[PDB]
Ligand binder design. Sequence first.
Ligand code: ZN
Ligand code: ZN
Ligand code: ZN
Ligand code: ZN
Ligand code: ZN
Lengths: 305, 232
Amino acid sequence: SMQIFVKTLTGKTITLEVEPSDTIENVKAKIQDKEGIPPDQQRLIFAGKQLEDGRTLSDYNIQKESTLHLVLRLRGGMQIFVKTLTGKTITLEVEPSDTIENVKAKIQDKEGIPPDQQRLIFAGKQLEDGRTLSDYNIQKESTLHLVLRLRGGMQIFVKTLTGKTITLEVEPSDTIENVKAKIQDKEGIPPDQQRLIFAGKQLEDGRTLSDYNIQKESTLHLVLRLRGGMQIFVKTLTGKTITLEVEPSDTIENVKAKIQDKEGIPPDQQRLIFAGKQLEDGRTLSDYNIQKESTLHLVLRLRGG
Amino acid sequence: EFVGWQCPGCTFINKPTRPGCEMCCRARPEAYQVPASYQPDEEERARLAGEEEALRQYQQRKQQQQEGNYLQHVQLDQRSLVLNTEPAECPVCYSVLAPGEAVVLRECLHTFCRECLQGTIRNSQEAEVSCPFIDNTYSCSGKLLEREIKALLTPEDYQRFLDLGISIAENRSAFSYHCKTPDCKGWCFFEDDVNEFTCPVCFHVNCLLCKAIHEQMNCKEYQEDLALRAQN
Ligand SMILES: [Zn+2]
Ligand SMILES: [Zn+2]
Ligand SMILES: [Zn+2]
Ligand SMILES: [Zn+2]
Ligand SMILES: [Zn+2]
């Protein structure tokens, strides 16, 4: 008979009296004798590998004063991997019956992350707290993703036309074109049609947050312009109303050419009025903010010859 | 001098590509470097495959958010007025406004009653109606779009709005001439050496020299008749 040592993950050294003819089952039953651990929960590691139950200490060439390493594993448990956006991978021991609630508690125990801040995603779908891993068909060595609720850091808020308020994570160096791209990443709105407004000031891309002195927890307003086919109304003094097809990039010269095609009036005899102003031929419809379903008034110069 | 990484907690030697220890779930120490020499076996290549598919499916999830979110923004161009989705407080009224009973201004994003905006439009002395919002930082310089103004006013008031707009431009030009028929809306711009303006509304011929209508007379006959009828 000989003595060997078993070292636990808690840091305890256990001594056992064993024989070379003892199987790994026998060694696990001795550990159950002393520590009360179920033998089919025990894993014994020697020479850096796991010992199989059917073999003996002699088969693995375990001698006197050899040190075995004990790891506890649920008999019906499995390992899964939760991937963060930071690139860190957490390895959890779970059971197929474990609920998403339990998995969050396991992530808290290991990584100190509160379940408040835990959103788990498997195969593109966010997992609900009452359902189990088997419900989502999460199997051995499956891979899940963990998205944390916040970073703290610096945040700003963007309210939109749909009533949805957006939360963004930026740094004072951030170009407004950058913040427009981060809005584009979360909402899909192309940056060229975004107008970010802080305190009534239109923000221009070149300047950054610190240069507009916009600190954290600010709330901005996102107004959207659009380049696309629109319809405007040109109204004569007689009440005659024609409907035009235009783009915001169209010139006033372009509009007068369209009126000439539809009503035969030459542009040199055309004077267009919008928002109490006469429209200059050089400027565009965007320049006057002439948007959809606007009414332009048409006054003709006096004929003579 | 083994290929794998030994677990500092349980001494199990794990395959290089595994992030956690196969026995005790401990994370692979960050100091360890995976040799490019290592070829993952069937278990590890399967796990890496599932990881790349998890990443693949997560990325297409975020693209569905992007496209799904964007279409709701484009959804709101289907109508002229944008309404409140949450309860709102009118900065002019102080009234509480249930969802769908307040208007969100498109150029400003400030939310108001239909009633106060109606008075703000009817009281605007400028052809461009400002948003009435004022706080201690700024007055808002955004303008109500005519789309929003037409949907906010009765057709009578909307027509009064357009009439004020064209008359604002008319008052601005000193080269304008208005039809002398009472209540007539016709008016024109002075062209050089043109002395008669046939109004397209009343069809009466306005003499631009006398700035009056004397169709049954000439300018001298009208002028002497004018002084004769108006004596002291
Ligand atoms: Zn280990
Ligand atoms: Zn109000
Ligand atoms: Zn405003
Ligand atoms: Zn007239
Ligand atoms: Zn005359």
